[PDB]
Structure formats: C-alpha cells, structure tokens
Amino acid sequence: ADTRPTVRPRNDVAHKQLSAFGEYVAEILPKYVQQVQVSCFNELEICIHPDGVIPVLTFLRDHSNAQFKSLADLTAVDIPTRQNRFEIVYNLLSLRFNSRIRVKTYTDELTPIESSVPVYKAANWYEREIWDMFGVFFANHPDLRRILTDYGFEGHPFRKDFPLSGYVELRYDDEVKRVVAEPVELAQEFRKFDLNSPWEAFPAYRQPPE
C-alpha cells in the first residue's frame, strides 16, 4: 500500500506465502515439477513434466495442506515457436485456504496427455474442448469428440496457423434444396492492420541478444 492512485498497491504478505508454499510442492514431487515461479501480481506457477499430470493434480486435490477442491479452468495455449507447440494450463481453487495456483504442462499434436477426469469431474468437457479446438489428444477420456466446432470440421480452429475466415462458407442452394459448402470467398477481405511500435516498450522484459 502506498499513496499513489495511479499504481497498483502491492500485497507482499501474500507474495511471501506463495514463495514459502513454493518449495513445499517442489520438494514433495521432484520427479515431475520442473520450474516453479511466482508472478508479481500474486499468482503461483508450477511447471510439471507432462507425465506428472495425475500425480501432481491428484496430490493438491487431496493433500492436507493444499486442499484444492475445485478446478477453476483448463485450456491450452498454442505456441508454434516451440517443439512442444501446445501448452496445457490448469487453474486450481482452494476454498479452505482461499488461494489459487496454476499448473502447466507441455505437449504437441502426437503426444497425448492422460485425462484428468479421474482427478476432477470438472474436466469432463474442458478436455473435449482442448481436443476440439487445438487437436491435443487426451488418453483414457471417457468420451472424446468435438464439442464446439461444426460436424465434420476438417481442421482445428484455435491453432495459430488456422486462417480466421476458415476454409468453407455455407449457403443455401435451391438446385439441391439443402445447405451446401464451398471454398470461402469474402465480399471484403479482412484488413490486416500492423500495430507494433518499433521502440522497446518495457526494458524489464527485454530478451537478451542471441
């Protein structure tokens, strides 16, 4: 807390607790946890080897000091610049201790991740979505299939290399008396504005030379 209305007041106490709670999980499951980091806005991050999805998520759900009962969110972040392009992310809640932790893995198109449905029933559908939109496959999922896209969508939309306008646009044809599909044609193309400023914005995050 400080007397500056245009800045965000830091809460260091909660930040210290996460760092203290940091090694707590790094020591307990060192077979999987690769990297644990804490962000300045009080959010804990745990980096786990993909195999340890069940050992780590199952632990926090039930341990006597984690007690993360509810799964807040489950998604993936496509990143085509890495060998493991995709990157799962689990957001966990803890009513007892009133805190949230984020657990991340890494996979690709052809390396499935064990379904976490056994750990949480919440991920019954979130795992369908990730497969549906990104293409990652989940092993042992009770029922894996498309949840969002249209039937027979020959592609995985949310991948960064999937054009925004798709590949086929529908229309109704009288000759055949049924909706049809054709290669996409746009009356007006999507204008692609270039916004990046050519001057370094934040020196703190500067990536060192190569």
């Binding site: 007006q188 999507f190 204008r191 504005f193």
Partner: protein
C-alpha cells in the same frame, strides 16, 4: 457474513399444525395468489402508445452514424482514419486524396450498417467531431444493399438531422 434462507422448524403445537392443515384443505395461500393478480388488474398499465409516443432516451443515445459540417458548411472530416482503425468490426472503409484546393478530404467513405455493432467508438476517436451517431433509430430497410451507407448517404443524414445532433452534443460535450 451469511444467513439461512430455508431453515424454519414448524412448531408442533396443535394450533400451528391446524394452520398448516387449514392451509392445505382451504388453499388459502393460493387464494392469496389470486389476490396479487387482482390488484394488478386495477392498476394502470405501463404501456405507451407507439408511434404517437416514444420511449424516453438520453443525449448520449447511439443511433444512425452521420457526418457533420462546420457552421460554414464545410465537411468536418479530414480523413484521419482514426475511426477506421478503431471500429472494432472493421465496418468502416475510407479513401482520401488532396482535393482540388489541396485540402485533405475523403473520396470514398463507407460504413457497413450490418457489420457495425453500434459501439460509439467512432465518435470517440474523431479529433474533429465529424462522424457522430444521431438520435435516429427507425431506419429499417427492405434490402441489404440499402444498409450500406457511403459518403453521400452519411453526409445527407448529417445535414438531415444536424438541427438535433448539435443540440444533443451541446448539452453533453462537457461530460466527455
């Protein structure tokens, strides 16, 4: 701090029980339900008479985009493409060339009233208060093409309503 919503214990005294027994065999609470409805029969309906009456609006209301002119008559827009670059739906198309007298002005200016989301960003980003949104909203058309407003249509609307657009902006330019 919380509270309990459904935690009442029915006291087992005869009189209380007889009430819950009285309620069932006489539908009293249902008779009460017919009461509230009866009252609303004798109230005054909140129905206005359209189109002879209109729903109250405010100076900030957003409606049919339009293009303004200075008091002299000149176009306010100077083809700065801020509105195009901010219209979230990319419903704005603009072109410009130096006019005969060498003044920056538009040549093609189009708003797609079907791609528009009526967000008000365009009137926020205009540095000269050229493109605005009039208080008109009754402009439904029988064809899709009619709802593609180009420069000529926008200018006419601005001239058409300018007697009112300024009146609203006058009362409200201070909050902005």
């Amino acid at each position: 701090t919380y509270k309990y919503v459904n935690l009442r214990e029915p006291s087992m005294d005869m009189k209380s029980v007889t009430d819950r027994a009285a309620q069932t065999l006489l539908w009293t609470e249902l008779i009460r339900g017919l009461g509230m409805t009866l009252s609303y029969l004798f109230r005054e309906p909140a129905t206005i008479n359209y189109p002879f009456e209109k729903g109250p609006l405010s100076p900030r209301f957003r409606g049919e985009h339009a293009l303004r002119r200075y008091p002299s008559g000149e176009e306010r827009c100077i083809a700065c493409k801020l509105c195009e670059a901010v219209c979230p739906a990319q419903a704005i198309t603009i072109e410009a060339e130096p006019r005969a007298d060498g003044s920056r002005r538009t040549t093609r200016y189009d708003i797609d009233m079907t791609k528009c989301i009526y967000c008000g960003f365009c009137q926020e980003a205009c540095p000269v208060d050229a493109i605005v949104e009039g208080p008109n909203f009754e402009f439904s058309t029988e064809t899709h093409e009619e709802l593609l407003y180009n420069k000529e249509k926008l200018l006419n609307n601005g001239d058409k309503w300018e007697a009112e657009i300024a009146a609203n902006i006058q009362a409200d330019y201070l909050y902005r």
